[model samples]
Target: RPLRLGHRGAPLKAKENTLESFRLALEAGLDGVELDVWPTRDGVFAVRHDPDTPLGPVFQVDYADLKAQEPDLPRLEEVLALKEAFPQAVFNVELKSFPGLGEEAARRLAALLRGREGVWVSSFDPLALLALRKAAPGLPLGFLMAEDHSALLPCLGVEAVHPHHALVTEEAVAGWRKRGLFVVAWTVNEEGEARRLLALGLDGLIGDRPEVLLPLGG
Candidate 1:
């Protein structure tokens, strides 16, 4: 069956990558939750969509430091612990890139989720995905493509390639599937597009609205 993965833990309603957001996604019957991780200066992995941004006055703090400031913002390790409680829901971790964090974040992630069910690593940056392969040779990596398909390597050792819906035509999806690369799309909100893509035999869909996905197969 195709997977319905949540983007930023139901970001439509809650703070992206926060504990509350992930819990809400699980409660809403999402098959999996997608989150991003960035490391702090102290080598601690933090759960957030971006490492640098201005969320408000509190935005000055880096990702790892944000958790110390906001109690609800858990570190990556704390978020992975949820796997023990919700063993059925898959976990998709998107590692954010930086000078040093990319490699270590991937390594620490695999170690933290050891023996955990349904774990997949993804990143917009191909180098981050490559780092993940170096960390855990057996761990499945989802190669993310924006518009640069030519830039993507052979997708060796990648279980899936997550390209945005706009970048994928029916011809492209079919070709990818034929080559053993499971085609998954991201951030699809329009009902018609969801219906259309699902009809094309996509392996998975990642969206902020799980309700839109549940009906795509129907």
Candidate 2:
């Protein structure tokens, strides 16, 4: 069966990437939750979508200070701890990669992600994925495609392809599947789109309205 994961944790119902949002997604029976991750200056990984806040960029601010500004932002550890109860669920941790911060984020991120069985990393930046591969060779990595750059995918050494929903075409899925890549589409909420992508035999779906996508998975 295709995996049904919630995007930023049932975002339509709760704040994206917050503990409450994650809990709601899990309670709603998603196979897992997808959340964005960035490292604080103090080396803690905080979960949220954007790097910007009123205080500063996440990389510039220490976690404690950043937490003060965005109290609802969760530490990556806090979310990982959820595995204790929902051990079967997957954690698709997307690195919010950008220039100059990629290596720093991956280096710091490596130690924390090691040995996490169900957790996998994904990013739009192949450099970040490569750095993560260097830092944590044992961890699985996925490439998040926002454009038509399948040419670069093989060089990135990632185990999966997470394309934006519109990019999951039959030919593309066939090529990726032939190469043994796990293919999952992101941010899909509508049943019609889900139906076509599911028919293409994607390995998983990451959606904002995960409850609606679950029934379509089988």
Candidate 3:
């Protein structure tokens, strides 16, 4: 069955990275949620989609202040805490390469999820993913790409390819699967597009509305 992952915690109406959004996704019967992470000035990991918040550039604000200003904003630890509440939930943490924090972010993430199940680290930056691979060889990694790079998976050392939905093709998906790489499509919100991707044999779907996509769960 193709796994259903909520994009930005099912942010169809809820705030993108808040606990409420994630909870809503779980309630809607999604298999998992995908979120972005950036390092703060104090070296803490903050769950946010943008480089800058209303407070300031995310890298400049401390996690405490960020949380204080936006009561709903969650730190990575807070989100991970949800794992205990939702033990079966999967987390796709996208490591956003903010300035020079790639290695630090990778290290912290590796330590946090060490030996944990149903957690994956993905990044559009291959360099970041490479650093993460060296930091946590056991943690599953996915390479997020806007274009086809199916032939580079072996060298990239990624277990999965997270392609922009429009870039995904049946032949490419099958080819990568034969090479033992998982294929996941991103930003697929429409029901017809979701059904089409599933029929094309994608391993997973990351969309803003899992309720719309996987109305009838597998």
Best by lDDT: 2
Worst 10 residues of 2 by lDDT: 209-218
Query: What's the lDDT for all of these models?
Result: 0.74, 0.87, 0.83
State residue 199's C-alpha deviation in candidate 1, in Å.
1.0
lDDT tens string, model 3, 94-174?
Answer: 988663667777777787778878789998877677778888889999999888766667778689999999987778777
Itemize residue pairs with steric clashes in candidate 1. Answer: none
lDDT of 2 by residue, 95-209 (tens): 9857568877887788888877999999888888888999899999999989867888778888999999888888988889878999989878888888889889898999999
How many clashes does the backbone of model 2 have? 0
- Cα lDDT, model 1, residue 202: 90
Q: Give the C-alpha miss distance for residue 115 in model 1, angstroms.
A: 4.6
Kindly report which residue stretches of model 1 are placed more than 4 angstroms away from their true locations once superposed.
53-64, 99-101, 108-115
RMSD, every candidate, angstroms: 3.1, 1.0, 1.7
List runs of model 2 lying over 4 Å from the truth: none
lDDT tens digits by residue: candidate 1, 138-178:
78888777884734647555878888888778788766877
Q: List the residue pairs that clash in candidate 2.
A: none
